[PDB]
Design a protein around this ligand. Sequence first.
Ligand SMILES: [Mg+2]
Ligand SMILES: [Mg+2]
Ligand SMILES: [Mg+2]
Ligand SMILES: [Mg+2]
Ligand SMILES: [Mg+2]
Ligand SMILES: [Mg+2]
Ligand SMILES: [Mg+2]
Ligand SMILES: [Mg+2]
Ligand SMILES: [Mg+2]
Ligand SMILES: [Mg+2]
Ligand SMILES: [Mg+2]
Ligand SMILES: [Mg+2]
Ligand SMILES: [Mg+2]
Ligand SMILES: [Mg+2]
Ligand SMILES: [Mg+2]
Ligand SMILES: [Mg+2]
Ligand SMILES: [Mg+2]
Ligand SMILES: [Mg+2]
Ligand SMILES: [Mg+2]
Ligand SMILES: [Mg+2]
Ligand SMILES: [Mg+2]
Ligand SMILES: [Mg+2]
Ligand SMILES: [Mg+2]
Ligand SMILES: [Mg+2]
Ligand SMILES: [Mg+2]
Ligand SMILES: [Mg+2]
Ligand SMILES: [Mg+2]
Ligand SMILES: [Mg+2]
Ligand SMILES: [Mg+2]
Ligand SMILES: [Mg+2]
Ligand SMILES: [Mg+2]
Ligand SMILES: [Mg+2]
Ligand SMILES: [Mg+2]
Ligand SMILES: [Mg+2]
Lengths: 117, 147, 65
Amino acid sequence: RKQVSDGVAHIHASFNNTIVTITDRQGNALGWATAGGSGFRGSRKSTPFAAQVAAERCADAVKEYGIKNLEVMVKGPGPGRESTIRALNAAGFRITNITDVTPIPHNGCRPPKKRRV
Amino acid sequence: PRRRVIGQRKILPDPKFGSELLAKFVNILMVDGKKSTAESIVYSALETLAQRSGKSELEAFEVALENVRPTVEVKSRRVGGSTYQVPVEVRPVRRNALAMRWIVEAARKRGDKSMALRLANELSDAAENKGTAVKKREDVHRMAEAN
Amino acid sequence: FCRFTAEGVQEIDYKDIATLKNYITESGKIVPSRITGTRAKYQRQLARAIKRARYLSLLPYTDRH
RNA sequence: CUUGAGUCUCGUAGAGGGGGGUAGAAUUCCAGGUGUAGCGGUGAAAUGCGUAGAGAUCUGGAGGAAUACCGGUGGCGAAGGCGGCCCCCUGGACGAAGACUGACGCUCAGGUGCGAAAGCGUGGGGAGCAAACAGGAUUAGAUACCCUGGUAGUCCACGCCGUAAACGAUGUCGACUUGGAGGUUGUGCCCUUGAGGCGUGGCUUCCGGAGCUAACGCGUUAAGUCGACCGCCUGGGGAGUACGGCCGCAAGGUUAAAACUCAAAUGAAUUGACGGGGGCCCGCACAAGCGGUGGAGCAUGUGGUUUAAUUCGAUGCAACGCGA
Ligand SMILES: [Mg+2]
Ligand SMILES: [Mg+2]
Ligand SMILES: [Mg+2]
Ligand SMILES: [Mg+2]
Ligand SMILES: [Mg+2]
Ligand SMILES: [Mg+2]
Ligand SMILES: [Mg+2]
Ligand SMILES: [Mg+2]
Ligand SMILES: [Mg+2]
Ligand SMILES: [Mg+2]
Ligand SMILES: [Mg+2]
Ligand SMILES: [Mg+2]
Ligand SMILES: [Mg+2]
Ligand SMILES: [Mg+2]
Ligand SMILES: [Mg+2]
Ligand SMILES: [Mg+2]
Ligand SMILES: [Mg+2]
Ligand SMILES: [Mg+2]
Ligand SMILES: [Mg+2]
Ligand SMILES: [Mg+2]
Ligand SMILES: [Mg+2]
Ligand SMILES: [Mg+2]
Ligand SMILES: [Mg+2]
Ligand SMILES: [Mg+2]
Ligand SMILES: [Mg+2]
Ligand SMILES: [Mg+2]
Ligand SMILES: [Mg+2]
Ligand SMILES: [Mg+2]
Ligand SMILES: [Mg+2]
Ligand SMILES: [Mg+2]
Ligand SMILES: [Mg+2]
Ligand SMILES: [Mg+2]
Ligand SMILES: [Mg+2]
Ligand SMILES: [Mg+2]
């Protein structure tokens, strides 16, 4: 509907998936698309190329609002997340700044026991 | 040459013209140590080259060379865990050798009812950019960029 | 490096925010002594003062606010 | 009598203990807002979650548990242990200079107390985590293993339990005996003091001398040289088991044998193996080249089969135009 021209992006980046969604200074989301929302499955859905295609299919899915700049909320060390942020950089968005918003608890909760081999 | 790479016998120049590049060419064309047979065909081909394709036979030699002598090739080396087709540019002697090899192999791939005619026609087409040696310079320049 | 001993303050109070923000990363985290060379006693005093300031919202806990 | 041991005055440091507040991250849930078909998981999926609108994102709320950075084998404590901040109550240590008591000391069977975690009782609370259990991946069978769930428990109160590789595998106290480097905490004096330089304590880490030790190693914080007292050991297994006593709600703890059986068991260090580990450097090993073999005919050797017999030996490289 309307115009922003400088939005904010959020790449929730797990080791098993990578979801990217944008909003505009308000949290009211505009367009979302997942690496898994593009036919990929298994390890395929966890590749920086999947990040490329998810970046693309969000940019085009929101281009109706025609944004021109971006903040990016990179969160979680998903494999190769510079990939999607520069994919969006090339997608016609002057990225303003990047922000590691990886939530860090101050010893708040006991983590689950990790993999054993 | 694990310890030290050793150089090559600096071959002795052509008796008919004192040039050493034609000497290396006749060594390349030679088969089974039959040097006399080889130099006969080489002289026969350069003489008719000096006629059917203008003068300056010794100059027409490099007129064909510079037309076939490559610049880049591929040297598949596994510096990353697998044989990677990395391209490399050559020194002058490497491209000289590859040029002469490509000339002689194409000449042998012609028939032409004589090896004199074979080499003559092939070297002419190479000098004016026709044939197959020039094509295998084209392919060596093409696959040098494909990876 | 051995700053407060050269100055000789009897106690690094929490109110002097101006002299605190140089012992703090831009993220708000306390910087170790092995980087600033402060003596361990004054490092402890600094930690206590910084935590009190964070409580009074003179300094930030982090930038996420 | 005052040197041991204590008392007083002034201070210093500290996750020492008990109680009560409070803060900010994060997890989960709830509420809506934005906003749709995936999320989540994996070897790959499935179970699961999502059209009742998730997931992602924003705002608000609720609740529990734990306190990133500081943070350091740094500190405190008899040990177990102790980590946001603030207050209240409270223990110990250390230093300076004095004053005071005048052997008031050390050790300790029995005894009394403290004592990680799990566990037990009663009542709470319950976010996360997670024995057991459930389900999915699933074979003569499901257990493996991994996932998705998940109760007890983990938390609080008050009771028990009293055991750990509760370890420095080193009982407590005192005296003495060459050094070097640190950390931490005092304190005296002093250069012009800050910085900085001389001291002088307490604690603590790492080297190493003599000495000691089977050796490894220990080495002023002794495993050195001595003294006081206590605990404990007497081949391995049987066995920290049986019986009995005591203790406990219970689980069990504690005290603690013998028959029998073996000729060893064990400690430290030494030399090699342990290549489906590393690193280095060689060789026509590869690379760069040239000519071949593998296809065809024939020569010859071997295997095979046949034969009356197809003589016998050589069989990965290192047998096969080899003995011949
Ligand atoms: Mg305390
Ligand atoms: Mg919160
Ligand atoms: Mg919602
Ligand atoms: Mg101590
Ligand atoms: Mg007297
Ligand atoms: Mg006793
Ligand atoms: Mg008791
Ligand atoms: Mg417990
Ligand atoms: Mg209970
Ligand atoms: Mg209960
Ligand atoms: Mg779970
Ligand atoms: Mg589990
Ligand atoms: Mg099962
Ligand atoms: Mg298992
Ligand atoms: Mg209790
Ligand atoms: Mg015991
Ligand atoms: Mg312990
Ligand atoms: Mg013991
Ligand atoms: Mg002693
Ligand atoms: Mg000292
Ligand atoms: Mg030593
Ligand atoms: Mg010492
Ligand atoms: Mg001793
Ligand atoms: Mg000994
Ligand atoms: Mg015995
Ligand atoms: Mg027993
Ligand atoms: Mg009994
Ligand atoms: Mg009884
Ligand atoms: Mg060879
Ligand atoms: Mg080769
Ligand atoms: Mg053959
Ligand atoms: Mg034979
Ligand atoms: Mg032979
Ligand atoms: Mg023979």
